[PDB]
Design a protein around this nucleic acid. Structure first.
Ligand SMILES: [K+]
Ligand SMILES: [Mg+2]
Ligand SMILES: [Mg+2]
Ligand SMILES: [Mg+2]
Ligand SMILES: [Mg+2]
Ligand SMILES: [Mg+2]
Ligand SMILES: [Mg+2]
Ligand SMILES: [Mg+2]
Ligand SMILES: [Mg+2]
Ligand SMILES: [Mg+2]
Ligand SMILES: [Mg+2]
Ligand SMILES: [Mg+2]
Ligand SMILES: [Mg+2]
Ligand SMILES: [Mg+2]
Ligand SMILES: [Mg+2]
Ligand SMILES: [Mg+2]
Ligand SMILES: [Mg+2]
Ligand SMILES: [Mg+2]
Ligand code: NA
Ligand SMILES: [Zn+2]
Lengths: 80, 118, 50, 53, 153
RNA sequence: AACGUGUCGCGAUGGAUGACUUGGCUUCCUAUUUCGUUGAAGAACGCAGUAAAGUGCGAUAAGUGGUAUCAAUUGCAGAUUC
RNA sequence: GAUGUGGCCUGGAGGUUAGGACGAAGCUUAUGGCGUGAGCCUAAGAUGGACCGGCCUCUAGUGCAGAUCUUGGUUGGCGUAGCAAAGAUCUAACGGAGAUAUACUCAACAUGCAACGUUGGAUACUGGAGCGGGGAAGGAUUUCGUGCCAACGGCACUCGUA
RNA sequence: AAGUUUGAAAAGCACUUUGGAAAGAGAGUGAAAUAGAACCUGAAGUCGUGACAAAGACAAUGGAAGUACCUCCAUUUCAAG
């Protein structure tokens, strides 16, 4: 029977954690990520989901070097 | 300073510590005003003040703390009691008091010298 | 009071099921005081657990 | 220009005992299955939205 | 602050309990029956209900409950014996008696004068139904307030 | 009789309205204004005397150095130009 | 279906004229008065605690009973339907606030019920394709000891994978 | 989903008494506790309680015209009127 009983027949897992992006979207059998396309050099980006683009773009994380370089540029690379 | 109420209130309530110091100033007495030609000074620990508005007006004391996160000063003679019986100090906004005796240091003297109106 | 811990430790020490461990119903105060395998072994030696 | 329309909402159709307004997709939240896009829905788009022209 | 005030405050005792985890409908019937009673009579009645020699008459929330002979003394044919509500009301009566003693009044003269039961805020659980449905399973607790006065012989 | 009905006084449940606004939306302007193999954006794990999240930071880790200020920080502890 | 109205009402702007801690907005009503009406105004609050009314112009996201309308909250049915597969518990002592809990009168019954953990004893069940003992997948502290009993374990708890 | 909007200030209820506890009854702070911690205001709907009016089965509601009883409402009159 295709409903409740068959729910108990689902055993393995299709996806595991991705090294590059951290989502549970790394397809184990085809060794590639459904979310970020790792290990292809560039990442997944599609204009039919601007919402997904805005979830992933620059500034959603830390910007730990960009803040520094922005300040240096604003101060004209001042040095003693 | 700002033709925008939203921006002015945001700046006031998010001011840093060294800006809160200046925002928490109190007028000097008439004698001190005449001696120094300065109208007001930021309040400092160990100065002497007299309360001018509120329930405790007329009381005198010495400043024990400028809390600066609650926007108040604490005076040693201004206090009350809890239900337990132990006493607690009561906070007063610094614009409601008058300074009667400054705590003098070399740098405070320099500050008064640069604020002199002569 | 509960002597569950002493019964479990005595089962482990004597190597039998719980149905074969006998705890004396008049020495509950003494059995309450044993918290280690060493103390329970002393109880077995003294005969409050057989 | 985007306000009130940032959902992938679809009508459930007839044959269920609910009004035919479009509804939010998904599950696991209190907004799932709620009414959407209409000027009479909470969180929907206003009637004749205003413009700068 | 109670919904009524005693005539003479100095000769009265009060008691109250909030968000009590007993069924509102059972406690309504259990508490309303002692309203005009002397305190010792009310306590005797509660003891006899626990012993099942007398019953509590159910007058409002009684749709399709059983019929009994012990309801005849109240002019009814329906009544029950709710022990969970009875023990809580016994506790409340003991508290009111202690308050009267501390004020310096004689408990063998007190007469209950005000009783009021109200629905409190509900708590939520859930139950599972056929074809994958989930449906509410709620609890209905109550507030109780009362006061008693000294009768003047 | 009881149950029920109606009106007024007082209580409960419920969270509307008013007043409030460090938020949003929209328009306009000024610049020695535009990241990365000299390893970016993103992702992970850590760091406080007390510290889950958040914020800041990287084994020099709720910060080192310099300049300017001038007496705090603060829930509790701890300790003038330092 | 057309049209008129020194016709009524709501948010904001330009003017003008007023009110308010001796109490603004909001809210309540067997509070009357005015108007054919939409509505307006006064009274009382044993309500509230800081803003706001009239008039002339300007402007609009400007008036609800119903759309199997949207979102939040209530409600009769209702102490109702039910909580019936896997056979089943009994007894004493100890533990616990969970008792042997009383106004006159009254020896005790007829006025404190119901229910619980541990140990001993009795009686049954699983019946080696096991409510036995170990592993993979999946889960990730659920494991151990001491406490605790608000919520959760669709009855209960002094007990618990809480 | 969700304003943390108690109060000027925690002054966030010492102490006594009943209870296993949660709490209750007193006492106290505050201008105010019907401001007691998710705490300004606190509507509608629904419910409890006290007092009162009655009332057959005529479903209830509704129109018109009177009367019995009530009325924290308004207005007008009291002596030459
Ligand atoms: K039944
Ligand atoms: Mg398969
Ligand atoms: Mg596969
Ligand atoms: Mg919107
Ligand atoms: Mg039946
Ligand atoms: Mg079911
Ligand atoms: Mg299912
Ligand atoms: Mg509002
Ligand atoms: Mg570029
Ligand atoms: Mg942390
Ligand atoms: Mg290093
Ligand atoms: Mg509209
Ligand atoms: Mg409406
Ligand atoms: Mg059954
Ligand atoms: Mg069975
Ligand atoms: Mg057998
Ligand atoms: Mg249960
Ligand atoms: Mg309130
Ligand atoms: Na508008
Ligand atoms: Zn990836």
């Amino acid at each position: 029977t295709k409903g409740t009983t068959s729910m108990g027949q689902r055993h393995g897992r299709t996806h595991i954690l991705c090294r590059r992006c951290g989502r549970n979207s790394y397809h184990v059998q085809w060794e590639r990520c459904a979310a970020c396309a790792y290990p292809r050099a560039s990442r997944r980006r599609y204009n039919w989901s601007v919402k997904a683009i805005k979830r992933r773009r620059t500034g959603t994380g830390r910007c730990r070097y960009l803040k520094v370089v922005n300040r240096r540029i604003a101060n004209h690379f001042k040095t003693p | 300073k700002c033709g925008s109420r939203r921006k002015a209130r945001r700046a006031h309530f998010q001011a840093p510590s060294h800006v809160r110091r200046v925002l928490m100033s109190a007028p000097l007495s008439k004698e001190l005003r005449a001696k120094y030609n300065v109208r007001a000074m930021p309040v400092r620990k160990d100065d002497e003040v007299i309360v001018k508005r509120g329930t405790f007006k007329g009381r005198e004391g010495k400043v024990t703390a400028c809390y600066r996160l609650k926007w108040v000063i604490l005076i040693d003679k201004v206090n009350r009691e809890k239900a337990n019986g132990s006493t607690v100090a009561v906070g007063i906004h610094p614009s409601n008091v008058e300074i009667t005796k400054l705590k003098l240091t070399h740098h405070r003297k320099s500050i008064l010298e640069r604020k002199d109106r002569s | 009071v509960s002597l569950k811990l002493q019964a479990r430790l005595a089962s482990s020490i004597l190597g039998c099921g719980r149905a074969r461990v006998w705890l004396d119903p008049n020495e509950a105060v003494e059995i309450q005081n044993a918290n280690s395998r060493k103390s329970v072994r002393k109880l077995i030696k003294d005969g409050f657990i057989i | 220009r985007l306000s009130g329309m940032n959902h992938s909402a679809h009508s459930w159709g007839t044959g269920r005992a609910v009004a035919r307004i479009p509804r939010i997709s998904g599950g696991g939240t209190s907004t799932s299955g709620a009414g959407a896009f209409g000027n009479m829905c909470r969180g929907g788009r206003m009637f004749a939205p205003t413009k700068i022209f | 602050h109670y919904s009524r005030k005693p005539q003479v405050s100095s000769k009265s005792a009060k008691a109250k309990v909030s968000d009590l985890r007993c069924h509102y409908k059972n406690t309504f019937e259990t508490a309303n029956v002692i309203n005009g009673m002397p305190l010792r009579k009310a306590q005797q009645l509660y003891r006899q209900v626990l012993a099942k020699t007398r019953c509590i008459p159910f007058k409002r929330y009684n749709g399709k409950i059983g019929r009994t002979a012990q309801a005849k003394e109240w002019g009814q044919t329906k009544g029950r014996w709710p022990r969970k509500s009875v023990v809580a009301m016994m506790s409340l009566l003991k508290n009111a008696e202690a308050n009267a003693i501390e004020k310096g009044l004689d408990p063998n003269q007190m007469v209950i004068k005000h009783v009021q039961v109200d629905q409190a805020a509900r708590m939520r659980r859930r139950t599972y139904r056929a074809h994958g449905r989930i449906t509410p399973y709620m609890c209905s607790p109550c507030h109780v307030q009362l006061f008693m006065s000294e009768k003047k012989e």
